[PDB]
């Protein structure tokens, strides 16, 4: 138990570990 799901290719982990709603352009200027 933890961050490691013990999977060859954990899909649920990637669905959780997603911060694409962040604005790179905005944070680059501001």
Swiss-Prot record:
Disulfide bridges in this chain: 5-19, 9-27
Tissue occurrence: Tongue, esophagus and trachea.
Subcellular locations according to the entry: Secreted
Family: Belongs to the beta-defensin family.
General function of this protein: Exhibits antimicrobial activity against Gram-negative bacteria and Gram-positive bacteria. May act as a ligand for C-C chemokine receptor CCR6. Can bind to mouse (but not human) CCR6 and induce chemotactic activity of CCR6-expressing cells.
Listed name of the protein: Beta-defensin 4
Gene name, Swiss-Prot/TrEMBL: Defb4
Portion of the full sequence shown: 34 to 63 of 63
């Amino acid at each position: 138990n933890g961050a490691i799901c013990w999977g060859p290719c954990p899909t649920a982990f990637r669905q959780i570990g997603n911060c694409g709603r962040f604005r790179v352009r905005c944070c680059r200027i501001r």
